[PDB]
Amino acid sequence: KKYIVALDQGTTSSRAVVMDHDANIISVSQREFEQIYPKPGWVEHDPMEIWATQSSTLVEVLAKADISSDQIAAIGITNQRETTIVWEKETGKPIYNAIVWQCRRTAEICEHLKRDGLEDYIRSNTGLVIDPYFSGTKVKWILDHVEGSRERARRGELLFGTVDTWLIWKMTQGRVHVTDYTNASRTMLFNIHTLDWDDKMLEVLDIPREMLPEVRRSSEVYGQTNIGGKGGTRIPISGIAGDQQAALFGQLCVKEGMAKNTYGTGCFMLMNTGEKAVKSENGLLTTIACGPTGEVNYALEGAVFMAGASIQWLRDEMKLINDAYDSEYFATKVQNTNGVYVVPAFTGLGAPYWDPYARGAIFGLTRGVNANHIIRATLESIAYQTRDVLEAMQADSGIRLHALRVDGGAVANNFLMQFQSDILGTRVERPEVREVTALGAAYLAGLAVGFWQNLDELQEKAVIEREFRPGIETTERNYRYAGWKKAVKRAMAWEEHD
Amino acid sequence: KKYIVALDQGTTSSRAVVMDHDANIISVSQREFEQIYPKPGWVEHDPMEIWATQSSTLVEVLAKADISSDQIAAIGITNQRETTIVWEKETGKPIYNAIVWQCRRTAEICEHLKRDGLEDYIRSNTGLVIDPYFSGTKVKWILDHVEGSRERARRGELLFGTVDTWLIWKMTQGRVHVTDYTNASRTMLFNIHTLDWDDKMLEVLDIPREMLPEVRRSSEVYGQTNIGGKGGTRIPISGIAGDQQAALFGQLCVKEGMAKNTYGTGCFMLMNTGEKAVKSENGLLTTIACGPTGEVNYALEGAVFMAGASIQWLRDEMKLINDAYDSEYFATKVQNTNGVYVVPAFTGLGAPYWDPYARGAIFGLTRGVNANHIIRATLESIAYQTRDVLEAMQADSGIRLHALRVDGGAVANNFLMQFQSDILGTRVERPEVREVTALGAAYLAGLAVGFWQNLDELQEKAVIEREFRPGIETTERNYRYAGWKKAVKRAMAWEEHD
Amino acid sequence: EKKYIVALDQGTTSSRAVVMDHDANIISVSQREFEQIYPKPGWVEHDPMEIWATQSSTLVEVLAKADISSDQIAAIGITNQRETTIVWEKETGKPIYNAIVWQCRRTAEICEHLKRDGLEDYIRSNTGLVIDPYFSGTKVKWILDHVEGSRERARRGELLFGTVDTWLIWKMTQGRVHVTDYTNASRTMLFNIHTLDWDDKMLEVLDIPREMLPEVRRSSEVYGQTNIGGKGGTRIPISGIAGDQQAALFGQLCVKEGMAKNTYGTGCFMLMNTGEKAVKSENGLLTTIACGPTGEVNYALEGAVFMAGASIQWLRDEMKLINDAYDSEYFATKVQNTNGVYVVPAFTGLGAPYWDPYARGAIFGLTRGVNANHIIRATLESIAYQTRDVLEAMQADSGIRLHALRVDGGAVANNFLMQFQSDILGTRVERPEVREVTALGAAYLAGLAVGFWQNLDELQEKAVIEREFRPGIETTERNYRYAGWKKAVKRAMAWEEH
Amino acid sequence: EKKYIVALDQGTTSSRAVVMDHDANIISVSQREFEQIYPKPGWVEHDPMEIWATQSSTLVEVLAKADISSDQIAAIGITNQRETTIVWEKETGKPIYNAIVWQCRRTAEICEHLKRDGLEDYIRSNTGLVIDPYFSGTKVKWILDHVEGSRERARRGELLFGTVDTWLIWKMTQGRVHVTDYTNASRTMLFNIHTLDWDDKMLEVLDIPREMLPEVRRSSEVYGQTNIGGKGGTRIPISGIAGDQQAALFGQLCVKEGMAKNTYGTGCFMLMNTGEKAVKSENGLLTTIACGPTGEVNYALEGAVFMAGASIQWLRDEMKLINDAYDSEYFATKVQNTNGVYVVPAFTGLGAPYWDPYARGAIFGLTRGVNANHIIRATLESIAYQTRDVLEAMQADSGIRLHALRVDGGAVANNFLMQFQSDILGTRVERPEVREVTALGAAYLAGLAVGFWQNLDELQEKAVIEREFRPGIETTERNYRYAGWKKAVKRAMAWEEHD
Ligand SMILES: Nc1ncnc2c1ncn2[C@@H]1O[C@H](COP(=O)(O)OP(=O)(O)O)[C@@H](O)[C@H]1O
Numbered sequence A, B: 001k002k003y004i005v006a007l008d009q010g011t012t013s014s015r016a017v018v019m020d021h022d023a024n025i026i027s028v029s030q031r032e033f034e035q036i037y038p039k040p041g042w043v044e045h046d047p048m049e050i051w052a053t054q055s056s057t058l059v060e061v062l063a064k065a066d067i068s069s070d071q072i073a074a075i076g077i078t079n080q081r082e083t084t085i086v087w088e089k090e091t092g093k094p095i096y097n098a099i100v101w102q103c104r105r106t107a108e109i110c111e112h113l114k115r116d117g118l119e120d121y122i123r124s125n126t127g128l129v130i131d132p133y134f135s136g137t138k139v140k141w142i143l144d145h146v147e148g149s150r151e152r153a154r155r156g157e158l159l160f161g162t163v164d165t166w167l168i169w170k171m172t173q174g175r176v177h178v179t180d181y182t183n184a185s186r187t188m189l190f191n192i193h194t195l196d197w198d199d200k201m202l203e204v205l206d207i208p209r210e211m212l213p214e215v216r217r218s219s220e221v222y223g224q225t226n227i228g229g230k231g232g233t234r235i236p237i238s239g240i241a242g243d244q245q246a247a248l249f250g251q252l253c254v255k256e257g258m259a260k261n262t263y264g265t266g267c268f269m270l271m272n273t274g275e276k277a278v279k280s281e282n283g284l285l286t287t288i289a290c291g292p293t294g295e296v297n298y299a300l301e302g303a304v305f306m307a308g309a310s311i312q313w314l315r316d317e318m319k320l321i322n323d324a325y326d327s328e329y330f331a332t333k334v335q336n337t338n339g340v341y342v343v344p345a346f347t348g349l350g351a352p353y354w355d356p357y358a359r360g361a362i363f364g365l366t367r368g369v370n371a372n373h374i375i376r377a378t379l380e381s382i383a384y385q386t387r388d389v390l391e392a393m394q395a396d397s398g399i400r401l402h403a404l405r406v407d408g409g410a411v412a413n414n415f416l417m418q419f420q421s422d423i424l425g426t427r428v429e430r431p432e433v434r435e436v437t438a439l440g441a442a443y444l445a446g447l448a449v450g451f452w453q454n455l456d457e458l459q460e461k462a463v464i465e466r467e468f469r470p471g472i473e474t475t476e477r478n479y480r481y482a483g484w485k486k487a488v489k490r491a492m493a494w495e496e497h498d
Numbered sequence C: 001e002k003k004y005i006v007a008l009d010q011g012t013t014s015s016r017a018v019v020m021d022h023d024a025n026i027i028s029v030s031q032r033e034f035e036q037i038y039p040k041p042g043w044v045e046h047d048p049m050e051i052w053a054t055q056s057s058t059l060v061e062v063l064a065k066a067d068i069s070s071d072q073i074a075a076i077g078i079t080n081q082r083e084t085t086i087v088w089e090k091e092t093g094k095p096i097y098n099a100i101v102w103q104c105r106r107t108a109e110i111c112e113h114l115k116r117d118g119l120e121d122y123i124r125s126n127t128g129l130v131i132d133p134y135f136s137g138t139k140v141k142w143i144l145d146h147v148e149g150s151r152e153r154a155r156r157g158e159l160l161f162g163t164v165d166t167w168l169i170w171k172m173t174q175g176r177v178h179v180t181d182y183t184n185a186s187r188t189m190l191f192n193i194h195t196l197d198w199d200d201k202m203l204e205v206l207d208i209p210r211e212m213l214p215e216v217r218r219s220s221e222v223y224g225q226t227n228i229g230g231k232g233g234t235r236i237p238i239s240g241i242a243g244d245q246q247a248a249l250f251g252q253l254c255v256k257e258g259m260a261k262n263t264y265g266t267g268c269f270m271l272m273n274t275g276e277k278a279v280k281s282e283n284g285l286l287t288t289i290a291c292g293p294t295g296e297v298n299y300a301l302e303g304a305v306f307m308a309g310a311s312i313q314w315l316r317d318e319m320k321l322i323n324d325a326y327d328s329e330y331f332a333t334k335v336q337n338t339n340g341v342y343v344v345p346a347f348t349g350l351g352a353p354y355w356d357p358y359a360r361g362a363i364f365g366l367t368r369g370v371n372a373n374h375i376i377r378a379t380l381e382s383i384a385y386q387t388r389d390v391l392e393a394m395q396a397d398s399g400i401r402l403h404a405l406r407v408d409g410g411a412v413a414n415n416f417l418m419q420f421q422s423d424i425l426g427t428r429v430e431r432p433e434v435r436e437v438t439a440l441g442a443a444y445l446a447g448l449a450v451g452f453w454q455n456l457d458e459l460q461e462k463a464v465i466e467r468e469f470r471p472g473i474e475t476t477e478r479n480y481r482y483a484g485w486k487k488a489v490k491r492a493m494a495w496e497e498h
Numbered sequence D: 001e002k003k004y005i006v007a008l009d010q011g012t013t014s015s016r017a018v019v020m021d022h023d024a025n026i027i028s029v030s031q032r033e034f035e036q037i038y039p040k041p042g043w044v045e046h047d048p049m050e051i052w053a054t055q056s057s058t059l060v061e062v063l064a065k066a067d068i069s070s071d072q073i074a075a076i077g078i079t080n081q082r083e084t085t086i087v088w089e090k091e092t093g094k095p096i097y098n099a100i101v102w103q104c105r106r107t108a109e110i111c112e113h114l115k116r117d118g119l120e121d122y123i124r125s126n127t128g129l130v131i132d133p134y135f136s137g138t139k140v141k142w143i144l145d146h147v148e149g150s151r152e153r154a155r156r157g158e159l160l161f162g163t164v165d166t167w168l169i170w171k172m173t174q175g176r177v178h179v180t181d182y183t184n185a186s187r188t189m190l191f192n193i194h195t196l197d198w199d200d201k202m203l204e205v206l207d208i209p210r211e212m213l214p215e216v217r218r219s220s221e222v223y224g225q226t227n228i229g230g231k232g233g234t235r236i237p238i239s240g241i242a243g244d245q246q247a248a249l250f251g252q253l254c255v256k257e258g259m260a261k262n263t264y265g266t267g268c269f270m271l272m273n274t275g276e277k278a279v280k281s282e283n284g285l286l287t288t289i290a291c292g293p294t295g296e297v298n299y300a301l302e303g304a305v306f307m308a309g310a311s312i313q314w315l316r317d318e319m320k321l322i323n324d325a326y327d328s329e330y331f332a333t334k335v336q337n338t339n340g341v342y343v344v345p346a347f348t349g350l351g352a353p354y355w356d357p358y359a360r361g362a363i364f365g366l367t368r369g370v371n372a373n374h375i376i377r378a379t380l381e382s383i384a385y386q387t388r389d390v391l392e393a394m395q396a397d398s399g400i401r402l403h404a405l406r407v408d409g410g411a412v413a414n415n416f417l418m419q420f421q422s423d424i425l426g427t428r429v430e431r432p433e434v435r436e437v438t439a440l441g442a443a444y445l446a447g448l449a450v451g452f453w454q455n456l457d458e459l460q461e462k463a464v465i466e467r468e469f470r471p472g473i474e475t476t477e478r479n480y481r482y483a484g485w486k487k488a489v490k491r492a493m494a495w496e497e498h499d
């Protein structure tokens, strides 16, 4: 009994990870899963595939690392936060695929609410923005979209759930219908002061309460699981959080003012705002983090929809790189983007913009622009975007951050990193372990299980493997930025409202 | 006595065709040359390299076809229209590279003029539009960049010329310094009415009249060349015309209201308006063509900067494809652009927009979008463009095309062909022989020296290879076209000038 | 309850997991490729943890993905890559050396003495085996000698040995179980095929402590149970074991004497069923245990080809000449002959009927016009060649003239291959509807065991000849191309220095 | 006045034209590759016209682009690929058949008849050539026998026979002149190297009308003029011709006995000057004619290897393994060695010291973990091997172990290869700054005639070794690797089936 196990249900892959008591990484599992675009603007995931992969990674992580059911103190869980599931309570079968948080299909529905004038209400109790991004719209969607859903829904025959929930249920044979604070926040269904489903929003979206599941603390005993092994082995489930929050947490951004920015399929920037929830005026998200004890807290969140994904697109779709990591190479074979700009609004915009109608776009093409500029453009867009939110933050925040605690798959790229310090004019912290989403999940659980007795017990745990100071002139910084800002403006509003 | 040679010094390649009296392409020779992009929006060529390749070709088609210097009746010359070259007479060495019609460096220069109510005149006098495209401002520009050029030139130390102009001089060792009408009407410098150098123009731009060459007829001995051989052999240069203008003539559009479309590096639609010059109101150019005799005729013209070039760009720069023939195969792997649009303003706008500041851009980008979608979007810009002008054409022309006739490299592409057909809803006629440009120069030089008594002998000559009636995909046309429009507006105004 | 049977295929390049219904319908498949280690030219290894880890996650995964729950599995079938040797520590359960693969050749040295020593007839007689590094014996000894004080702990109980099945079953029973079937045991070169038990002459020759040995068992029989979680007290019976080859002969219903099949996976295996008589080869073929219609020990004539689908992987992965294995046929068909080039896929020694551990891969007949495609096709070709090779011996040894070859394996997707083979043999060819005959074989057995099925014939109406390739062209070529091939071989033979 | 000499390099794969000056620098170059045609597996053909046309445009382009007038050219030097045989109609000036590339193997059969009729000794002694389908003889005859009434017209004075120097010049004199040189003429196996003239037995044995051969001349000397137009009445002396190998040797100032060079191109050639002395060789080398310090007649030991640069071109154009020959280096350095792989590149048979028309190209040591890097790498090494093969025959035959190796050719750029090479022989490898040496010879051969330069000394210090490669591999290793090759080689032999 001396291992903790984090579960990370990524946007593109399912991960499984293994730490010890000194919190190292004994092992990793990963599997990607099919991403579906039934139609341009839309994103879906197979719930079944989401599962399997997530299960198998679990099982495969121990196997290979040669660990037995028995030594697993507990299991923590983080997931991508907005994607929505709905299935028959009985058969445990989805009434429709999972709609990822990217999928813009409920834009239209958003229009309605915007118009009924719920904007202030929503910013107010949920702290969210009216976006197809959030779960509510989605649920109403399956709901309206499937024959007598609403009905079954009422007869409590159907279960609504995010990923964490779905995970756990499956996990516990349908025994446990739960989810933690953090994940509830982004549903735009649950009140954040109150701390429990906004009664108003259910009516609004026309959503039968029967369907929701209990909400709990992010750090706590929720259940157990039997994955086989040596007769009588049950594994506990003591930790749940959205990756974002997980990272935040595994980053030890446990006081107000503390923040990090993560780089994976998207970009997330979160600042801990302690016990008090700052209402943003600069196009940010107010949300729930975790205190040093898995306690409710608040946070300022800036969400970027596309980051490493552009890069995935380069390779899967554009097929211009053979592997992610190549980007560094190619992008550095030139001195600039040669006037080029990418606006990766592939799935709309996001903070601080919030533009369901924007699409992805390339700018300032000329004859002599080759592929290397493009790729490089792609990277930098990442860098701009952040700049977009960071400011917003300092705006809303009132704090002027002095360095950037980043993390994610992509922090591995040094270019992007340098580029980022430059463009920012800020220091950039690069911790020695980049799977913190996973840590935050280990941390939360084992906490819940006295695997660790408190945070501090970790503290000297977090190590900056490298830091980046800028190097470029203010003039050009702003100079390049302006370009970016203009590029943005050309993109927004592309798609037509039906 | 047996053959005539056409010479096509095209934007991207130098060429040499051998026709017989029967009007048959007996042998061919292509050579490609370097495209220089000193910087974004600028495109130069090496004048020597132009020379270089163009001589090699001629020398090459001949050998190959086992043809002796004596057997050639005349030499015709066609060329890329607007590139300016400038050299010393005493040495025949350029003070600068050829500056391309593409090249957008003289934009500032155009704003001065615009600023000086110079417009009405220019249009009036030259039938052109203020824009970086003309050798006008170009010339000037070199003059201002090279130390004490002006003075030398005044003292007639420096020669000025277009391409034909440079070729002929080169080929007649300095002996002859001349130009034809068509060409000359593309300088901004020359009066299409008058039939001679506009002084205001020469004044306004401050170009020394010494540098200009003799404007001549499109069909007329001008001199001769010595390419060795038996000995005593001298070959005459009987024909000259701007390629756009040569193509039109080779299409035998010698009567008023007869049109053609040309797709090579760029796109150029022309209409023979007979002895009367029609003034554009729709963004079109008024220019000089040839009569059925090689005599001054007038044409309305639409000009698109980027046509075949894009495929080359995907090719050389993007490397998405291996060959331009390819493109088709990729485009037909998908059934729509996935809503992605491309605007090939790599080198500014042009007809009917004229916007030296537009730069290329790709729009409606999304995650399921791949290379093919892209390649295909690329070909579509092509038809979109042609549709654009084709309409100014009919506004201006008042004539409704009951069918397009076309030519150039690109027309071998049936995707392009058929698309174009459905996009326009008009029929598209494709010849068996597509180098109708060379033909036109064959035709002129030939007509000149008695090789053929008239166009008559050449009428029975053509043959349509394919006629592209518009695929049912002629219902959804404004719809497609409409995205197009939207898209363009978004391309417009990229580069910074203020 | 219990509607499903699960086959486990632990192949040389991947591990699978297959779910059948009572109708013997693959309700789900799972794969995951795994590393191929070549510490040195001529040697192949695997990681027993990786073999494990893969095999694990697959099972878990097919289940998952198909929504089948543990309570529903009547039993589990088990198949494996046959010769590969593993040696762990009973306590820790950890290995003291990587799986050494049948392919591997480090043992020829040892093998060298055994020849030296006179051990032919015996080995062959009692084993029906030949002296070669293909078989586990030599391998074992090897590790024993390489690992320090192996023999001690070996005799002190301490170390276990196992083939794959051994290794997987040991692992799914927590160590509780240490079984093996006949089929499998035969391939060790350690155990007596007549006697039905470990041959101690051997054990003595090779100096292998019987402590470390496991128990030979019945191919169809409950050996034990596994626990993979679920509704407490859930466990699954392990009723089936076979070497995939034999495993395959069975799935294919070749349970009567004179019945054979050919299998095209990573390699090539032809086996004929000899009823209860163990026919002694005299043409380079092996004699091995097989399965009667009840799991009963039968006997077989077997031809073992080391490089078959392996070659194609080489091309794609190593030569990188291909993207997908399915590509191969396309390219090959791109040429029309191989331009007289031959490929000899002896990357891993010779194998029947030659057995030549000193031969290495080689390519012949190259010329300046020989290109990739020709080469590819040569590769494919080499497969139908090695086949015709053994097929002859089969009918030497068998004395039976097979009228049509029945086939199976992953590579039979190849129409080209299938056709070429047809022609090369000048015999018809039967492609089944399903190709996972191997996993099938395994389900059958373990299901027969647990009464899933009461008899084969139940399953007879299963098997649908999806396609039949009849011999194409005339003899002449046949023999002609063959001679070509023979030549080649002889020059492959004897490369390595020993 | 006349401030420049121009060299025409006509190679097996591309047509060149170089422009130098009095200070023998290179003002410019123009190349162009031309189609390799393989009618049948082991058959090598070229469109005479393409050879022509390419040489033309190249000549033209150098001038044109360098801004150089016919009036400025002191003369044209000429070199070519050596065995490729062209035969055309005197009237029309048209090839009766493609040009048969030296590489071509189609005449083995015929070489058989030869050996069989006891001629090995003679051929070896008057011509200095070994019986193979390498040389011109059989080619001609082949043609001859294959074209209906050729022989007839060929006596009837209507048909012409030429190597490539010869087809060029005549194409550039409008048929005025039909000449050839010592160097080239010696590779036909129809020319006696002492007598220094057309072999009768030769013509006899082979049935070739004396009436078709150009006339044999010096290497440096004025043979004609050409007119390429320009400023009226401009003529250009054609003042030099040599087989490019001999050209290289020459352009290396390889001019006294003991002096030798290795050239690495589409093939690989190694030759060493034996002065005036014609050494018959026992070790498989070639005996031929080279140039004296004045263009006078010299002699040499040649070592001819069929594929060097061509092997890579096969990776690049056929196997598509690399996209650029220069890449080679890159790839092969991603590996420490070659996983026991060996590439024997007998695409075109053997060649010295082997001499095996039946030999095919092959690959050995194949194993599962062998990737394309190893193949490329092996490819490279084969070059090094073969060199070491001829190299030895040479020391055998001449008693001298080369202290340093003077090299050149297009492939000498490959640093890897260079080094490997050093390693494999355990000899120093001198790399000149200008590797374009074949041309240079030609220029030298020309300007010299035309008195452009009066002596070679004028030319001496003009040479500079850009790089020296010393062997960095332990003897054992060195030899060890050799033995392997040697083994591989044999397996390669006699693959082909001779009825
Ligand atoms: N099959 C093809 N499909 C599409 N575009 C093509 C195709 N072939 C050539 N192109 C383009 O057409 C142009 C060559 O046409 P051409 O008319 O010969 O040149 P130019 O206008 O300068 O004289 C290049 O831009 C080339 O990519």
Ligand SMILES: Nc1ncnc2c1ncn2[C@@H]1O[C@H](COP(=O)(O)OP(=O)(O)O)[C@@H](O)[C@H]1O
Residues within 6 Å of the ligand: D010, D011, D012, D013, D014, D264, D265, D266, D267, D308, D309, D310, D311, D312, D313, D325, D326, D327, D328, D329, D409, D410, D411, D412, D413, D414
């Ligand atoms: N870096 C390199 N490595 C290997 N071969 C090279 C390299 N660079 C050029 N080459 C090769 O050298 C040959 C060119 O020979 P060169 O001396 O130019 O041509 P030629 O055949 O006419 O003598 C080509 O076959 C090319 O494949």
